Amino acid sequence: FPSAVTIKSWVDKMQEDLVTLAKTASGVNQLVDIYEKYQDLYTVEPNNARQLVEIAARDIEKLLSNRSKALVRLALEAEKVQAAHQWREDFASNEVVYYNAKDDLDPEKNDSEPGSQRIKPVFIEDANFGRQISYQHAAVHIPTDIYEGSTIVLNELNWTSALDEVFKKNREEDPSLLWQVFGSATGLARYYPASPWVDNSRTPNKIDLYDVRRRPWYIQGAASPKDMLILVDVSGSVSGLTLKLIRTSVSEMLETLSDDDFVNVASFNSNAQDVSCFQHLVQANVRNKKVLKDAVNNITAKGITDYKKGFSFAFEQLLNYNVSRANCNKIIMLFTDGGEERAQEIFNKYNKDKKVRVFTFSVGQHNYDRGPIQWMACENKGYYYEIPSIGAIRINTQEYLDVLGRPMVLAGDKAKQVQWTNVYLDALELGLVITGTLPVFNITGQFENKTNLKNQLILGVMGVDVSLEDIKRLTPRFTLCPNGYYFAIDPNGYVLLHPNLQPKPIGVGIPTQEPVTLDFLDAELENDIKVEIRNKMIDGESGEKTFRTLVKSQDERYIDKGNRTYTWTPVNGTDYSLALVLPTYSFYYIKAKLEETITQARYSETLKPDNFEESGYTFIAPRDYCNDLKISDNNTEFLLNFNEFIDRKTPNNPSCNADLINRVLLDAGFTNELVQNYWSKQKNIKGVKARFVVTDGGITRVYPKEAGENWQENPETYEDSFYKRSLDNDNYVFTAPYFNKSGPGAYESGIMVSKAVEIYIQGKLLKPAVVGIKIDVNSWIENFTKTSIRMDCVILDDGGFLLMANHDDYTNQIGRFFGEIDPSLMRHLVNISVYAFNKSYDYQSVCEPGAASKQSCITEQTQYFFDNDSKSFSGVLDCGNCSRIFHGEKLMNTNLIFIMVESKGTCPCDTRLLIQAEQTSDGPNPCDMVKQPRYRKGPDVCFDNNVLEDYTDCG
């Protein structure tokens, strides 16, 4: 065992060698002084985060107010044109002409109902929607389980033509509108841009179960937030088919509860108990709904019924005010079959002011008495539903929600307020959208008062979709550092907008149409400062906060010790709150002063893929430079069209943004001046395998043009993990290649090395680019084993990944996590606390399904980093019945640590492994997360318990 000073100087000499090689070949200084050499070619401008947040909040509120105005127009016209409708029973004499969405494109003259003539439209391909779109009329969706020629459906299809016309008007005053739709309460759905239904028109194994009245936006706009409590009657008499139907019905009832709704499930048989681990009303989000569904699926029937001990439990759990709730619409859902017990005194004791509804469901095919079941609904403002078989399950849930909207109708114009739903995946696939709803009231008898029989029910709900990518375009991101970004938030803390929000459903457990509800604390790493910021944003305040944050790298494999500054404002007129993350060095950006029309041309000439031998292999970020350019995943295609458009650019002045092209051309020119005046004068270094420079404008020219085929970084520089990592870290960062990845690999590509330029203009810190070297593995291993005369030696970077070693069998598994190699040293070296680790959760990850294609689960990813700042570490590894010695030295001015451990093939301490990998897991235990739930602000105004409501419709 060499002494500490010997291997200390050893590490010092390797770090001197590596730093000198990287600094020379990379040419940080040459790119720097090129950047300061042309201060007359640009201007440095500030990123006033306060004004940026205010501007983006104003823009988003303007967009949402535009959609609100569209909704108001549509709802007013719907009410007016249904008020003046004449009921009919004969449509043979007067056909209704409409386009049915699930019509085959074949010119079939025989696909018409008696009372309806079908339109055959001319479908154009549209860029906004990505489907066939006809602007000449609205399309109609009628569920399969609903006949499309009955009297109700035919009358609705008759009076919705004015809706069609107002659809046209709305789209004519605002060409950016997406799907705008009337969700009828008869089952129909009439959206304006006529497009064929998704895949379910006529396709085997593609059945169309879509029903507009179950959709989250319809569920949301049809009533006010609930406080359910599903009483399931698991007694003896419900065994067999009845219990199957009850558990399916409870699942389908839970599938109609939003995140503003609170629900628990109880079950009684001579004794009432909770079916799950929850002891009170919990929020009805995806995780809690799954827990309740599992508990209901795991339920068995036994014992004698007792309707008094069950309703006592229900009324007691609805009297709990210690927990978070939505103090509104208290309900009891009784899932029984029948009995001769009315329990008058329980109701008279607990529900005497009749503050709580009771919806009773007589599930099953049986001959038990159904009188008390129908009476509990009458004396408690409820309604009585029957579920004789699966297939009747879907319709009755929509129907209690039909009942709950009576108090909302009676409040004439105080109940017509626009509400936006959680981020969900559109049916007519558009990606991620939020829908703004407004309910439509039946106003036939009004100011000419008639019997007004069913004037307490809504006609439907009008929705208009806002694309999430449409919100993303109101928050311009390219004037910020690749580490700076915007994000918005719900009142529940979910993110309207965030870089880590992907168009995938939220995972809920282990694999074996829910909304994309991703909390703010789960889209990032969670400190306590971030909990304070989240609570401040939910309340709708404004403020600033500068602090130190662990910023996880994009590749989800490292953690860096960042330096952030959150500024937030509420978006006026809505429930959303916008914030802007901004690094401390990102307060200034370079504004390209390209107005010569010739300098930009001599910059542009560098970009055709015919000069890729004096200038490096060029990739361009597929940004929206001009709208006539379509971004392409195949990058060289986009480069070709970019060159083509640059060839004739001058007349396209208003067609596109000048700033992006000016900056990208300026950066291309600077990169060319670097690659010729410093890289083309040398042409060859033994150690290097590739020299690259990546710039925020989009230029990522890699020099040799040979490793450019081995280059696997994203063309858009703002999504380059190493580029974002190297800006926060003001030092050299080595990115260990991927292990066991099918492709160019590591030997014939090298290992990535990078440092970020740190130029100063007017005494301001701004970092416009990164340079780097793809050091070859052999040219390092020879130099590492060259000095061995002056075996177990390993090099580790941040995250504990083996960059390279000496045993020559570890170098076979290069880049692989060191804990997978010898986990005992990994655990011990963590125990010294040189490597801290953070374990977090990824709710939006694809997942291989096991046993009890790929589903989505919650994966539990961990990342390691330098816990302490100390440089020298020594100790003894107390292996089981043996002893091992190590010394650790962190190379100065890099992210590396050298471990001098001398022990191979000793007694087996390889009991387990430290597998730093995206491990499949269950999420946090929900039974423990509902007792300290995250802060959350419920909706303010809700409508229940009106005195004009006519309860004599128990059905």
Ligand X SMILES: *[C@@H]1O[C@H](CO)[C@@H](O[C@@H]2O[C@H](CO)[C@@H](O)[C@H](O[C@@H]3O[C@H](CO)[C@@H](O)[C@H](O)[C@@H]3O)[C@H]2NC(C)=O)[C@H](O)[C@H]1NC(C)=O
Ligand Y SMILES: *[C@@H]1O[C@H](CO)[C@@H](O[C@@H]2O[C@H](CO)[C@@H](O[C@@H]3O[C@H](CO)[C@@H](O)[C@H](O)[C@@H]3O)[C@H](O)[C@H]2NC(C)=O)[C@H](O)[C@H]1NC(C)=O
Query: Could you tell me which residues are annotated as the binding site?
Result: 233, 235, 237
Residue 595 β-bridge partners:
none
C-alpha dihedral (82, 85, 90, 96), degrees to nearest 10: -60
44 binds, options ligand X, Ca ion, ligand Y, none, Cβ within 5 to 8 A by partner type: none
Stretch that binds ligand NAG, among 53-61, 303-311, 508-516, 623-631 (CB under 6 A): 53-61
- Least spacing, CB of residue 442 vs ligand Y, in Å: 4
Q: 762 or 952: whose CB is closer to ligand Y?
A: 952
Q: 483 or 735: whose CB is closer to ligand X?
A: 735
For residue 636, give Cα distances in angstroms to 146, 642, 660, 692.
51, 10, 19, 18
Joined tokens for residue 461: 């709900």
Number of residues interacting with ligand NAG: please give it, by CB under 6 A: 33
Q: Which one among 20, 43, 546, 731 touches ligand NAG, defined by CB under 6 A?
A: 546
Annotated binding-site members for a divalent metal cation: 233, 235, 237
Single-letter residue type at 15: Q
**For the window 660-699, what string marks contact with ligand NAG as x by the rule CB under 6 A?**
----------------------------------------
Joined tokens for residue 746: 């590591």
Q: Tokens 């160019």 — which residue?
A: 744
Q: 58 or 504: whose CB is closer to ligand NAG?
A: 58
For residue 180, give Cα distances in angstroms to 37, 163, 164, 497.
54, 10, 10, 22
Which residues lie below 8 Å from residue 409, measured CB to CB, with a gap of 6+? 415, 441, 442, 455, 456, 457, 458
Stretch that binds ligand NAG, among 490-498, 540-548, 659-667, 806-814 (CB under 6 A): 540-548
Is there binding between residue 202 and ligand Y (CB under 6 A)? no
779 binds, options ligand Y, Ca ion, ligand X, none, Cβ within 5 to 8 A by partner type: ligand X
Q: How many CB atoms lie within 10 A of CB 693?
A: 26
Let me know the angle formed at the C-alpha of 55 by 40 and 533, rounded to the nearest 5 degrees: 110
- Least spacing, CB of residue 684 vs ligand X, in Å: 10
Smallest Cα–Cα separation from 534: which of 524, 521, 523, 522?
Answer: 521
Residues 304-333 that bind Ca ion (CB under 5 A): 305
Residues 767-806 that bind ligand X (CB under 6 A): 775, 779-780, 783
d(CA 911, CA 908): 7
Could you give the maximum distance between any two Cα atoms of the chain, in Å? 105
Residues 86-105 that bind ligand Y (CB under 6 A): 87, 89
- Least spacing, CB of residue 748 vs ligand X, in Å: 16
Q: Which one among 26, 100, 237, 729 touches Ca ion, defined by CB under 5 A?
A: 237
Q: What is the 3-state secondary structure (H, E, C) of 289-319?
A: HHHHHHHHHCCCCCCCCCHHHHHHHHHHHCC
- Least spacing, CB of residue 785 vs ligand X, in Å: 10
Q: Which one among 12, 45, 104, 173 touches ligand NAG, defined by CB under 6 A?
A: 173
d(CA 269, CA 232): 9
- Least spacing, CB of residue 21 vs ligand X, in Å: 4
Residues 413-452 that bind ligand Y (CB under 6 A): 442, 444-445, 452
C-alpha dihedral (43, 47, 53, 56), degrees to nearest 10: 20
Q: 144 or 546: whose CB is closer to ligand NAG?
A: 546
Residue 462's SS3 state is strand
- Least spacing, CB of residue 9 vs ligand X, in Å: 14
User: How many residues can be counted in the chain?
Assistant: 955
C-alpha dihedral (854, 860, 863, 868), degrees to nearest 10: 180
Joined tokens for residue 270: 């001579």
Q: Which one among 134, 158, 184, 224 touches ligand NAG, defined by CB under 6 A?
A: 158
- Least spacing, CB of residue 830 vs ligand NAG, in Å: 8
Q: 371 or 850: whose CB is closer to ligand NAG?
A: 850
DSSP string, 104-153: -SS--TT---TTEEE----PEE-TTTSSEEBTTS-EE---TTS-TTSHHH
Q: Which one among 6, 417, 677, 833 touches ligand NAG, defined by CB under 6 A?
A: 833
Q: Provide the binding-site residues for ligand NAG, judged by CB under 6 A.
A: 54, 57-59, 62-63, 66, 81, 94, 158-159, 161-162, 173-174, 176, 298, 300, 320, 322, 546-548, 563, 569, 572, 584, 634, 636-637, 640, 831, 833
Q: Provide the binding-site residues for ligand X, judged by CB under 6 A.
A: 16-18, 20-21, 24, 686-687, 775, 779-780, 783
